[PDB]
Amino acid sequence: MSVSAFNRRWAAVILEALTRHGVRHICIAPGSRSTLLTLAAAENSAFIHHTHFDERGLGHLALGLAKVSKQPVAVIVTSGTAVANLYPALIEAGLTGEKLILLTADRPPELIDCGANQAIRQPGMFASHPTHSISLPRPTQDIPARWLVSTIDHALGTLHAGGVHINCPFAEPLYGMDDTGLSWQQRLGDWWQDDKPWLREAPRLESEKQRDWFFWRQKRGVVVAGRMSAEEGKKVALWAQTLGWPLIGDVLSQTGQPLPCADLWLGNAKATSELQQAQIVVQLGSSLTGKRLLQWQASCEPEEYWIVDDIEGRLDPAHHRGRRLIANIADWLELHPAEKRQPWCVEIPRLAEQAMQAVIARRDAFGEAQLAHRICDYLPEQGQLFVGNSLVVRLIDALSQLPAGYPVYSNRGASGIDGLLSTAAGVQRASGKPTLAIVGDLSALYDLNALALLRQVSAPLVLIVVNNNGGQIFSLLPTPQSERERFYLMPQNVHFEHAAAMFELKYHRPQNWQELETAFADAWRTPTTTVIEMVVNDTDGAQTLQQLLAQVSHL
Amino acid sequence: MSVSAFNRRWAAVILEALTRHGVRHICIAPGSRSTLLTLAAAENSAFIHHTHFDERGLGHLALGLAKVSKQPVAVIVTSGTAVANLYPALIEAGLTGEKLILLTADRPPELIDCGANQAIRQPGMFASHPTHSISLPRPTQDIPARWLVSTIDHALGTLHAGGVHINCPFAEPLYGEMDDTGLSWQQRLGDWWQDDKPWLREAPRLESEKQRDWFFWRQKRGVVVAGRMSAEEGKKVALWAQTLGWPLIGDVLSQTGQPLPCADLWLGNAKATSELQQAQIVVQLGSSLTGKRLLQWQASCEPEEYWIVDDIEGRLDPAHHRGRRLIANIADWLELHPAEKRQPWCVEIPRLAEQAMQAVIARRDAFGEAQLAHRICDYLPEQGQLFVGNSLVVRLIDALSQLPAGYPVYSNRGASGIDGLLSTAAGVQRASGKPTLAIVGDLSALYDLNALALLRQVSAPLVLIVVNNNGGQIFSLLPTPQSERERFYLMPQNVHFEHAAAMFELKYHRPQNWQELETAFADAWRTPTTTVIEMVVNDTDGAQTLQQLLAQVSHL
Ligand SMILES: Cc1ncc(C[n+]2csc(CCOP(=O)(O)OP(=O)(O)O)c2C)c(N)n1
Numbered sequence A: 001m002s003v004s005a006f007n008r009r010w011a012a013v014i015l016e017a018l019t020r021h022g023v024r025h026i027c028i029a030p031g032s033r034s035t036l037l038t039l040a041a042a043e044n045s046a047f048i049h050h051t052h053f054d055e056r057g058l059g060h061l062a063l064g065l066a067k068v069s070k071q072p073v074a075v076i077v078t079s080g081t082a083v084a085n086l087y088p089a090l091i092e093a094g095l096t097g098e099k100l101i102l103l104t105a106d107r108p109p110e111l112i113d114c115g116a117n118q119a120i121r122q123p124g125m126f127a128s129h130p131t132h133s134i135s136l137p138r139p140t141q142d143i144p145a146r147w148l149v150s151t152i153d154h155a156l157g158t159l160h161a162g163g164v165h166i167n168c169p170f171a172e173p174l175y176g177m178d179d180t181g182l183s184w185q186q187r188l189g190d191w192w193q194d195d196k197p198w199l200r201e202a203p204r205l206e207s208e209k210q211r212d213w214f215f216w217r218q219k220r221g222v223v224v225a226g227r228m229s230a231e232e233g234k235k236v237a238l239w240a241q242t243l244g245w246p247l248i249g250d251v252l253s254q255t256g257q258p259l260p261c262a263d264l265w266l267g268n269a270k271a272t273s274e275l276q277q278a279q280i281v282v283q284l285g286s287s288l289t290g291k292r293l294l295q296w297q298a299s300c301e302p303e304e305y306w307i308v309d310d311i312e313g314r315l316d317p318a319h320h321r322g323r324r325l326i327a328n329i330a331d332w333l334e335l336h337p338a339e340k341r342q343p344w345c346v347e348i349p350r351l352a353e354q355a356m357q358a359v360i361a362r363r364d365a366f367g368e369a370q371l372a373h374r375i376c377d378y379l380p381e382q383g384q385l386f387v388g389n390s391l392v393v394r395l396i397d398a399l400s401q402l403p404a405g406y407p408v409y410s411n412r413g414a415s416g417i418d419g420l421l422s423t424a425a426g427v428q429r430a431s432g433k434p435t436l437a438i439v440g441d442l443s444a445l446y447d448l449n450a451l452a453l454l455r456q457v458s459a460p461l462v463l464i465v466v467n468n469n470g471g472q473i474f475s476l477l478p479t480p481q482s483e484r485e486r487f488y489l490m491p492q493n494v495h496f497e498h499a500a501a502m503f504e505l506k507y508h509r510p511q512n513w514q515e516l517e518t519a520f521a522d523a524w525r526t527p528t529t530t531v532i533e534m535v536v537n538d539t540d541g542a543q544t545l546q547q548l549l550a551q552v553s554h555l
Numbered sequence B: 001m002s003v004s005a006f007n008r009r010w011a012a013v014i015l016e017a018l019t020r021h022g023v024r025h026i027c028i029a030p031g032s033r034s035t036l037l038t039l040a041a042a043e044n045s046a047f048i049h050h051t052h053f054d055e056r057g058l059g060h061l062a063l064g065l066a067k068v069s070k071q072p073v074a075v076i077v078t079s080g081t082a083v084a085n086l087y088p089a090l091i092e093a094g095l096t097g098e099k100l101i102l103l104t105a106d107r108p109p110e111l112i113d114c115g116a117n118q119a120i121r122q123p124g125m126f127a128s129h130p131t132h133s134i135s136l137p138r139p140t141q142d143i144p145a146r147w148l149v150s151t152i153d154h155a156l157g158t159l160h161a162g163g164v165h166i167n168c169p170f171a172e173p174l175y176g177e178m179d180d181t182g183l184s185w186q187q188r189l190g191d192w193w194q195d196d197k198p199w200l201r202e203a204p205r206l207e208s209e210k211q212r213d214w215f216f217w218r219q220k221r222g223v224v225v226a227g228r229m230s231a232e233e234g235k236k237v238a239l240w241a242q243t244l245g246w247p248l249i250g251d252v253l254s255q256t257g258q259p260l261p262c263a264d265l266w267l268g269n270a271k272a273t274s275e276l277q278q279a280q281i282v283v284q285l286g287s288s289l290t291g292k293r294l295l296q297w298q299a300s301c302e303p304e305e306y307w308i309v310d311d312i313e314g315r316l317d318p319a320h321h322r323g324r325r326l327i328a329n330i331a332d333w334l335e336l337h338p339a340e341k342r343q344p345w346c347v348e349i350p351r352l353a354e355q356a357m358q359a360v361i362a363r364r365d366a367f368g369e370a371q372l373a374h375r376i377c378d379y380l381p382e383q384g385q386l387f388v389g390n391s392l393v394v395r396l397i398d399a400l401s402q403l404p405a406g407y408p409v410y411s412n413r414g415a416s417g418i419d420g421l422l423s424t425a426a427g428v429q430r431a432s433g434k435p436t437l438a439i440v441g442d443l444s445a446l447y448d449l450n451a452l453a454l455l456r457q458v459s460a461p462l463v464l465i466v467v468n469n470n471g472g473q474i475f476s477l478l479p480t481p482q483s484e485r486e487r488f489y490l491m492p493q494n495v496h497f498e499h500a501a502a503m504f505e506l507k508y509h510r511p512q513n514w515q516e517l518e519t520a521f522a523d524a525w526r527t528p529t530t531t532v533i534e535m536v537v538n539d540t541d542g543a544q545t546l547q548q549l550l551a552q553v554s555h556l
């Protein structure tokens, strides 16, 4: 009889099911309609439980977790606007490959389209953004537990990447408990004390080994390093070296950047020339950062364009004739090995070295370009780097040479300035590692309430808020000068000292290299967050990037 | 010739079509793909432009501005997750009626599903929630200007309520010297440019016809329920119900003056529900009923007819009575359906109502949130407005307080999200330019904390009361499980707002008693600025006080 009882039983099946697909972290916001789920989640010791109050921030907390752990991560929110707040993180996951399990509680059908409080149309909400969507029915004994678990299983197990939306209607009552659904739960036999799914469906998606690799490696080819794992970046740096091919590695590639300041040199006739001679470009990973690289890539004309990543669909915004190959990068390289061939490029290496030389000559100024340049003086040892959006990711790319195999993380799929503080958190938590995060002032304002989560870290995390008073990328872009402060830049004339106090975070506003150094030396001493604020002249960053762009276009 | 110049006239037409549907305010966030729309929005002087860095907050600003002005309000965002951050406000629009028109910039088709940065599938992302959606094609001269403005005029002319999604693809280049490429293209509309009118006028009226059996129905023993409506409508509903001598069950969102206050306590006494059992008809004006006992009574009553009269569409009766659903401007309907003077039929309820109120008054003294809820009418700004937050505050004020007639009350009680409250309030004050009282709980203030930025520009004093019971104490009102309540429900954040207030240069007070609270109330009404007032309370005293009071009154 007890509708309470059953409800908690139906939710219990749901949350154990995900025990079977590697779900370790579950992130939770409060709600009422959510109780069946949250309880079930709370009572299951297979999980590490996180909570936050801002469902959008929650979503990015899961995102961060998933991004580092490479595990599916489950989220529970209540019905209503709460669910919609998950959209951003979902969109990004749908683009970058994070597996997010979204369990969104709902009113029963009796209560849809009839003026009931907090009652929205929720199935289909995220349209084509989730990889799989599940519209669960009105919980009843008449549908066996085996159906419920078989559906969840198919969803999770055939999940190459992106998230999964599972909608979970619950009618009232929701608080009560009885035996009511016990015999129904036990129809699942010893599955309850098992390790595995009820239904095992986990076929692999992989592109066959390319039979003409041996032909193609003998030609003048270029390697492009996209977003990939720390370790894939090492394996790739080595692979290109051996092949003799010039490596143009993005900031997110953790390849070592053997030809640094690419955003610069790629802007020089002598470089484009040499590169014109290539016949095959093999790009590994995607979401390329630099402006000049995207243009080079747009207009480059090799006989064939290869792109290799374990994410599905097209990744060439330019639509070259060629191939799109789905694989684990490290797995793909083993399968397409390199043979010792001799470097064919001779003028690019000069140009790279000269372009870095141009940059260090400009290093003394206490600005954001200078910070980005000098960033690997600051990387916490055995740690990880979370890079913001806007100017920051573009600066470090253009100006800094990151070590091979140092892990970098970032939200570069859709590039939102909306989840960054909270993504950084879930990144810090997933790996246990000291973390450095850099973000601009509008991005830290966006997600300012994530300063709450940053009270619970498992190793030091330093948040650098580069404060140039507004969205200054819109001073790098040729935005109509007259409208640009009010409708582009939006300076908020703010600081972050009180924001840090509120969440009892340690704060520094260093005013030169000496004091920012002391800041760090205090930061890494304790398993807490410290807000560091660099206040800089609004356009110094972008101007300087521009001048170096011209400098390097000229030699 | 120049692509970037055609893009500008393509946008300029779009923003000029808005101009002829009453669109006055337009809320804008930064962006680059949005640039043509933002240029055309800012070049076009028919608008008042509002800007904000947070697109969910921007969304909620637009919502507020619309909530007050009753005009459609425009938003401009760039492509990506910026678009997705408008969902909250859109869905709330979907329920309470605000016309928000969302101009969402986009990459052109080529750059979709190809690994392009900041490029997501934008058409349809909001599903059924917007009222209509336009999926505008790739800008070209081969599509007559007269097409773009007809399609918008249809969109806006036929919008009875809720949101509009206009997706705007634009292809690089987006910057250049403004040639005069699409000019003769623009000139194809002709003097329309100098008119004030829609190109196509399509604005057919949706309304329910006159209830020809009203003279019969108005003579029976009815009940009048008053939900969300306009302040003016409140007054009107209060007269009309006292005329028919029916008992008025007014919601806090009803603005009737609640002649039977504390309905949430007296509806729990077995004597009231017994009397009401006599009702042959219930005429409910407006929707989103507030308290639990009125919801429980609504679901349980069994008149021969139930009527919901409101100017939004669809069913509004979550209990699905036999009866009628009646779409119209409430006042208009009062005029079409006049009251006849008849004898009050209710003997018991009016006695309990004054007995409920007395019982609350007995407890007015303690410095907690139940008390604040009760006293509030003593603190309303002269000729100003009330923005009432979600969770406890709405329910306590509903339960424990009696607000005056026709005092404007605003809130987000459609989906009841605590995700956009401050940012909504700002928009709510900007729309009318009235002194404003927004009350909001601690998690609700963390959720929109960056909206503090927006509450640095107010035309008129606005007080922000933050009630800090260290958590979501509505989860102490509900029978949640004692074991996991604290970390999985209440989520106490252990925080204050002194510094948040300092951060945005907003005056702060943490009053400890009634003397201090009213002091802070006074100096606050003397400047067109926000003064934040944080009331720190013992977490469960609010919940309990209500609980107890529900119990005392169920025994009277
Ligand atoms: C959700 C969302 N809103 C808006 C944008 C557009 N956008 C890109 S960069 C940027 C500027 C961010 O400013 P700041 O945080 O200071 O970084 P800075 O530009 O100074 O480098 C904006 C608003 C976006 N990418 N995502």
Ligand SMILES: Cc1ncc(C[n+]2csc(CCOP(=O)(O)OP(=O)(O)O)c2C)c(N)n1
Residues within 6 Å of the ligand: A030, A031, A032, A055, A078, A080, A081, A082, A085, B390, B391, B392, B393, B415, B416, B417, B418, B419, B440, B441, B442, B443, B444, B445, B469, B471, B472, B473, B474, B475
């Ligand atoms: C966007 C959104 N997320 C979650 C909820 C569910 N919810 C309702 S009340 C509440 C707690 C609000 O806490 P607080 O702001 O401190 O007010 P109080 O409960 O103390 O009245 C939550 C999380 C909601 N209605 N909307």
Ligand SMILES: [Mg+2]
Residues within 6 Å of the ligand: A440, A441, A442, A466, A467, A468, A469, A470, A471, A472
């Ligand atoms: Mg900035």
Ligand SMILES: [Mg+2]
Residues within 6 Å of the ligand: B441, B442, B443, B467, B468, B469, B470, B471, B472, B473
């Ligand atoms: Mg609270």
Ligand code: NA
Residues within 6 Å of the ligand: A021, A022, A023, A070, A071, A072
């Ligand atoms: Na896993």
Ligand code: NA
Residues within 6 Å of the ligand: A200, A201, A202, A203
């Ligand atoms: Na299998």
Ligand code: NA
Residues within 6 Å of the ligand: B508, B509, B510, B511
């Ligand atoms: Na004070």
